[PDB]
Structure formats: C-alpha cells, structure tokens
Design a protein around this ligand. Sequence first.
Ligand SMILES: Nc1ncnc2c1ncn2[C@@H]1O[C@H](COP(=O)(O)OP(=O)(O)NP(=O)(O)O)[C@@H](O)[C@H]1O
Ligand SMILES: Nc1ncnc2c1ncn2[C@@H]1O[C@H](COP(=O)(O)OP(=O)(O)NP(=O)(O)O)[C@@H](O)[C@H]1O
Ligand SMILES: Nc1ncnc2c1ncn2[C@@H]1O[C@H](COP(=O)(O)OP(=O)(O)NP(=O)(O)O)[C@@H](O)[C@H]1O
Ligand SMILES: [Ca+2]
Ligand SMILES: [Ca+2]
Lengths: 308, 308, 308
Amino acid sequence: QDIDLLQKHGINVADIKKLKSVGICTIKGIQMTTRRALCNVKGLSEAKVDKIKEAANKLIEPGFLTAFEYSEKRKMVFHITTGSQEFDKLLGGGIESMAITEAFGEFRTGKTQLSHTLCVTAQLPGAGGYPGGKIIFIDTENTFRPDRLRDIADRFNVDHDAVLDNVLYARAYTSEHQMELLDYVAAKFHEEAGIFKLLIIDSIMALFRVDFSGRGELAERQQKLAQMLSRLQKISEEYNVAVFVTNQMTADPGPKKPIGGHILAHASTTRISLRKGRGELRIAKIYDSPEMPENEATFAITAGGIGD
Amino acid sequence: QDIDLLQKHGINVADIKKLKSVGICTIKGIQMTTRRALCNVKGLSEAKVDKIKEAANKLIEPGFLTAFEYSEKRKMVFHITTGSQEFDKLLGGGIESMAITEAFGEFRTGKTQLSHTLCVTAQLPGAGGYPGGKIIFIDTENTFRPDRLRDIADRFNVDHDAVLDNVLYARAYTSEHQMELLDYVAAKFHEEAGIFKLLIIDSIMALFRVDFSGRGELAERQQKLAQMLSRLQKISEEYNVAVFVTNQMTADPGPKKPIGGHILAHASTTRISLRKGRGELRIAKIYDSPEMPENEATFAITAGGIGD
Amino acid sequence: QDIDLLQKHGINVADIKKLKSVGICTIKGIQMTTRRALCNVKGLSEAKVDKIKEAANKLIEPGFLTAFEYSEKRKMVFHITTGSQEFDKLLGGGIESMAITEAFGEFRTGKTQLSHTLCVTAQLPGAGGYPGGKIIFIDTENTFRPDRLRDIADRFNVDHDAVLDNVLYARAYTSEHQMELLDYVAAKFHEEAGIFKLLIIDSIMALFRVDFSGRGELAERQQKLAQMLSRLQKISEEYNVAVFVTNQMTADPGPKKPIGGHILAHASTTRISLRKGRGELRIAKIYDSPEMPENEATFAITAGGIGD
DNA sequence: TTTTTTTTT
Ligand SMILES: Nc1ncnc2c1ncn2[C@@H]1O[C@H](COP(=O)(O)OP(=O)(O)NP(=O)(O)O)[C@@H](O)[C@H]1O
Ligand SMILES: Nc1ncnc2c1ncn2[C@@H]1O[C@H](COP(=O)(O)OP(=O)(O)NP(=O)(O)O)[C@@H](O)[C@H]1O
Ligand SMILES: Nc1ncnc2c1ncn2[C@@H]1O[C@H](COP(=O)(O)OP(=O)(O)NP(=O)(O)O)[C@@H](O)[C@H]1O
Ligand SMILES: [Ca+2]
Ligand SMILES: [Ca+2]
C-alpha cells in the first residue's frame, strides 16, 4: 500500500515528499516509526504529526484478531529449501520467511557454501507453490565468487545468464555501510512489488569486531548492532522476505561460543551450528527455534553446493 | 583516484593536507575509514566530517551491481604461480590477488623456501597475461638470504641485477613495527601506481608469541592482531595486490594446531598445510578455500626453489 | 651507537640513566623494546614515551631497502670454522653470525667436544678475513674443563695463556640464572665494542626439564623458554655475534626426538644431529637450514678436538 | 562481553 492514500485524507502533498526523504514509502512504515522519529529528526510541529497518524488509522485496523483467523493470514509465509533433504526436515521445510535465521560455524564448516546454494535454490519453483524470485547478497568478507554459482547452476540444470542476472550484490566496506545499504534494500524491494524473496548477509559481526575494539567501546558496539537487527526484522515483515545471516565464533577460556552477545541471541529466531565431521561431511544442529526441536543431520559439501 | 578531486567540490585545500597526515591518499581510503576515525583522532569538527563524506559520494556509486556485471569487474584479479605444476592446480592457477593466502607448516616444510620462490616468479610474465612487477618482503625471523635468490634466478634464466633491484626489504624488530611498516607499504604502493604486485610477510605470529606471553595478555594480543589483519585486507583491495602470510604451529595435548586463534582462521581466505614426506618431497593440502576442494599434491625443494 | 645522541634532541639527561637501569645502552635497544615494556615496567607517563621514540627516528632510517643494496650490508656476517674440512662444507663455511645454530645429539656424540673446539678456533685468523676475538661460555651441566682446552691449543700451536684469558665463563645454577646472566652478556658486549665474537651456551634445556616437571607446568615452561630465545636472537643482531646452542634428546614410544617443542624448533636457524658411527667417528647431518641442503659428513673426535 | 596456550618418556 503506497503512501498516496493519505492526501485524500486532507494531508498536503508537500508532506508526502518529506516522508519519502527519510525512507518511508509504505503505510506500514508509518506504523513502525515512533512519533519521536518524525518530530525530532525532521523538526516539524507536533500538530503536523498526529495529522498523518490519524490518517493512517483510516486504513488497516487497530484491534485484535483471533488465533484462528490469524492462522490463515499466516499462509503467505514460504519456505526456501537448502539443497538437501535431511537439512530441510530440521528446519521444517527450509528457511522460513518473516524471520531471521542465523547459521554460525567454526572455521571451514560451509557458511559461504550455504549462502551460495541459496542464491540458486531460491530461484527455482519448489514446495508449497513457492515460485522463486530475485536475491540480494550483502557481502562483508569479500568471498562472493560468481563462477562458483556456475558450478551449482548446472546441478539444477539452469542456464548461466538467468542465474547471475537475478542476484544483486554490494560489498559493505565498513560498519556504517551495513546501515547505509539497508536504505537501498528497502528501496529495491519497494519498486518491484513482490519479486524479491531472499536477503542474504554474510558475517554481520565481521566488521563490528574491528571497528569497536576494546572494552571502552563495548557499550556502543551493542547499541549500533541492536538498531540494525530491529531494522532487519522490520524489513522482513514490511515486504515478506527471508533473512539469512552468517556468524563467526570465539573461544571461551573461563569450547567455542558465537560472537555477539545476548542482543544477537535474542533477536535471532533460528540458530544453526555447523560442525565438521567425516571428511566432506558436516553436522548441523538446531539450538534456538520457536517450533522445531533439537536434532542433528549431515551435509555433503560437493562440487555442486550442499547435497546428501 | 587521487584526493585532489574534492577541492573542486568546495573543500578547502587545507583539509587535503590533514587527510594526508593520517595516511589517506586515495578516494577508497575515505570509503573504508569510519566517521569516528576522523572526528575523534584528528583535529576536525562534525560539520567538517560530512562535508568530505558528501564530496566522496559525487564519485564511484553507492548502490548495487548484478552478479553478471560484477563478474567482468572481477577480471582484473591475477594469479601468481608458485613454481610447480601440481601445486598450481590446487590453488586454481596460483596465489590469487585481492585475498590473503596463509601457508602454515611444522618445522622444516619449506615456508621461507616458498617465499623465496615467489620473489622471482612474480617478476616473470606468465598465464592470463600477468606481466609481473616489484615485490615487498617484510621479515620477522631474520631469514631472508639475497644470495639464495641467485640460485633461483638462474633456473628461470634471469639476470642477477634485475632480480635483486625489484625486491624491497625491511625487518620488523617488534610487534609495533609490524603496524608501523604498513604505513610505508601503503605509501610505496601509492607512488608507482600499478607496478607492485606482491606483499610477502614472514611469520606474522613470530612476534606476537613473545610480546604478549601469558593468559592475562591474551585479550590484548588478539585485539592488536585483528586490527592488523583488517588493514592487510584493505590494502589488498585498495591497490590490487596479493598477500602471502607464513604461520607457525603449536602442539595440542588436550597432533599439531596453528598458532593464532579463530581470528586468524576467519580472516584468512586460503589455508595450506605443508607436511614432510619422502626425503626432499613435501605434501601440500588445502584446508580452507571458498572455491577449491580439499586435495593434495607433492613438492620438491630443489636447489632452484620449488619444483616437481 | 650509544644513547647520548638523544639528549641533544631535547631529552632530559635524567631519562638517560633510567633507560640504563633497565638494560638499554644502544639505539637499537629502543627499536626492539615495545612501548609496553617502557610504560608499564618503569611506570612513566605516556607523553614521556613517544618523546624518546620520536628522538630515535631522527637516526637510522624507517623505510625499505632493495635486496641488492641490502646484500652488501650482509657482508659483515662471518663464519667460524669448526675444525674439520668436511664439516664446514655442510654449514657453508662454518657457524654463521647473526643466527642461532643448534646441534643436538644423543648421548656421547661430541657436543661438549664441539663447544671446546670453538673456544680455540674462534680466536684464530681464518677465512673471509675473520680476525678472531674473545668468547663467552655459559655452562649448564658443569662439564667445562680448562685443561681440556690445553690439549686443543697445542694442535693449532697457540700459547697456553692467550687461550685461557680470552674465554669468559659462568655457571648457571638454575633456570632463573639463564635469564639473569643474559644481562651481563649484553653489558660485556657493550663495553669492548667489537671484540667478542662467539656466545656458546651448553644444554639450554638441561635446566628446564627439572624445574618445570609435569604437564600442569608445560604451559609455563614453553613461555619462559620463548622469552629467552627471542632475547638470544636480539643480542645476536644488536652486537653481531654468533650463538651456538647444545640440546638433549628424549625417546618416542608413540627412535629419538629432541627435547623442546615447536618453540625451540622454529626459533633455531640451523639444526645439526650428531650420531655415532665407526669407533671414534661421528656422523653429522643437517635438518633445518634456510640455504644448505640435507647432507652428511664424518668427524673424528681426537685428542686435539674435532678433526678428520 | 571479550579472547587460546602448550609436549613428555
Ligand atoms: N567447490 C567446492 N567443492 C567442494 N568443497 C569445497 C568447494 N569450495 C569450498 N569447499 C570446501 O568448503 C570449505 C570452505 O567453505 P567456506 O564456506 O569458505 O567456509 P567458511 O566458514 O565460509 N570459511 P570462513 O569464511 O573463513 O569461515 C573447505 O573445506 C573447502 O575445502
Ligand atoms: N680428549 C679426548 N680424546 C678422545 N676422545 C675423547 C676425549 N674427550 C672425550 N672423548 C670422548 O668423547 C665422548 C664424550 O664427548 P662429549 O662431548 O662429552 O659428548 P657429550 O654428548 O657432550 N656428553 P653429554 O653432555 O652427556 O651429552 C666420549 O666417547 C669420550 O670417550
Ligand atoms: N638450497 C637448498 N637446497 C635444498 N634444500 C634446501 C635448500 N635450502 C634449504 N633446504 C631445505 O629446506 C628446508 C628448510 O626450508 P625452510 O623454508 O627454511 O623451512 P622453514 O619452515 O621456513 N623453517 P622454519 O622457518 O623454522 O619453519 C630444510 O629441509 C633444508 O634442508
Ligand atoms: Ca566465509
Ligand atoms: Ca655435555
């Protein structure tokens, strides 16, 4: 729902352009920002504020739904399969939409091999009537290889040009670019309404470790990180996409432990750990999930991505 | 792209000299440093900060590329061959640019024999139209021998004077010099734009083991090390060179294990282990690589470097 | 190369005496110690620290040399011959300066017979214009015999008094004395500038085996040892001497193996093994060397030292 | 909230 539906509610059209200057295009963007993010960042009068907060209430309802009539509103969620059959039974059918799925691993356990398989598998028609669409890949470690996507595209028998032209790409150079680029992701989702399906970020803490070193900067690091994860949760519901996030690990003297404190641990919905086993086999295990229990499976990082 | 393109964007020329006093010469140096590294280190003001961050946006784009149109931007990456044919098929053609390749070994497995061969092989025209250029060699163990480069230069039939005058050299005496010298490497790459090709460091952890001994100094050791590896990754993309890094090993009581924790293991792109086999034959094996699988080969440390 | 050249750079003369109280006499002693070894061991302000680190930069250059112009700076390295002709062709002319040469053996293979020959041979004029000088002998096993040096001094036809007065001697009683005595070696090299040539230690691990027994003290043993070997490498370049080190052996159930783990194996430059053969003949073999290949020779421990 | 070290007989 675009924002032009409010100028017929007595709002000036000049207020429509200034709401687009801060990054608000849809009517749910009004319902997520506070009154403090409009009054004290633009600097308008507070009579100018509730005139567009009253106009947003002449729309999608304020109130309550039953759990039964909400459950049929939850049918638009899809599941993007990962590439192997046992790994989908862990997650319940693959990587869920309207959520943040985080898969951390130690050193070589296939986290950019998993993100390269999803750049091909999310373009194919699959289970539940999922039609497939374009993909945005924000990079952090400089480990995206386009000719590695060719080795996976011949396993599913898809042509070379259709795979690489449906994958956007941008490298974030510092931790300010990781919050700069999320303005261009929200604008890219807004134009082609309903085409994009997946947003893959590589290691989100790969740039926070080196830009906020020490203990005197720990309080700012977990505050610039929490404002990013709340933005990723809002984008994932405003436009109905799936977010996949790679994480790193540290030791624990007093035995590993994921980087990022309780703030990354609470905001994430699904948590997977990849370990290394027999040769080219990896072992995946669910820590945190609202519905799936703790179980294990086995990968195979082959020449065509992740298999069995 | 030099930094003089911003004084035509209303910036004072006095701001150009103070940006050079902290080590920023190119326009990508602006795009990598934060706003906190300019405001809270140098004598500048807030309003003085976004005036040069707005001027840097009137340049190379912020936005997104497709993977297909990015793949032809990835043609400027080269590959420096190592000296033997089977060892190049492991890495995919040799040591890649825009990356950090780390080769660790146990005790005598040819790690300064491999770094002496690259001081000759990266000056010769080779595969993919790679023209060859100068080389910077930062030393840590005091094991660089100039008359050892003569024994390798006669194998490729190159004169003595042309080999030794295209190899710079500096010994780092302590772990502060390893971060001091990387200012002079960035200045040396900046003058002759496009001549240097390789940056070889010897054992980067040979000075961190003895300057930060104990467990009360483990937290500072892995924080001064992470700020160095992020600088090596930035230099390797700002000027399009290849970084080669030697590492040592420790035991593992509970069987070897490389020195340097998960921080060196994540920042490195390619990981090679050299073992000792039959006599003068060594055995190389890939652990970590974004594209190449785990396979093995065989060396021969001869009198002319590494052969077959 | 004394430290008085900094009081003409605005430094107080009272700072000159406190730098001598911690063992810094030459300008290269500033270039090897960190900023943490001056700030947190003396307890000065950190404005007092960079005032002498800026004053040390108005001196011998920071920067880069070519390999050709460095190769003529490597002409001051000498070679101390061992006493037999075939054993010098292994090492390339004898025991090199600016390095650490370690010769381990099993039980009776002539390691204090080799260290007694070098107490005479390093006082004689030899190849490459090497003039000969005084010798420091740190003992660990109580096996230095002065009247054994007389039997070797008549083979080279040198008088008795000139041999014994050019050999200093001190016995280290425990593993704290091995780090205590290296303060007096640095002071002895500093007074007669250019007279001393050799520093012979006997078995450096003969006192670390008995003072750190167990596995609960293995982590401290290899950390007090690594701080000693980095001090021996720094002294060997600060004053241009040669270091010779004797080592012991252990078994290997799962066949011998040298005592001292990967830390002694990496810091050592040249590694020789002495085996026993036909009667009074021994067999020497190179393991680790940056330039010489693995080859064998034969000794003869005669009544006048090592011969052919 | 952050960060792994180190072979013996
Ligand atoms: N095409 C391929 N076929 C088979 N195995 C591969 C292939 N590419 C990579 N591998 C293996 O996959 C592992 C590396 O995968 P990768 O996704 O890079 O792990 P990673 O965790 O991302 N590395 P890092 O970023 O440092 O944590 C190594 O074991 C490689 O040998
Ligand atoms: N003057 C000499 N003439 C001939 N043989 C000698 C003489 N002195 C010692 N030896 C022999 O040399 C061997 C001892 O040499 P030595 O250098 O002490 O070995 P070592 O390894 O140092 N002993 P250790 O310190 O316990 O390992 C024995 O075989 C002696 O018999
Ligand atoms: N010119 C040469 N010809 C043949 N073999 C050689 C030559 N120079 C060295 N070697 C051998 O190469 C090995 C040493 O190579 P080197 O690169 O020093 O290993 P390294 O791992 O760097 N040693 P380290 O630094 O302690 O780990 C030994 O086996 C030597 O015998
Ligand atoms: Ca990765
Ligand atoms: Ca002895």
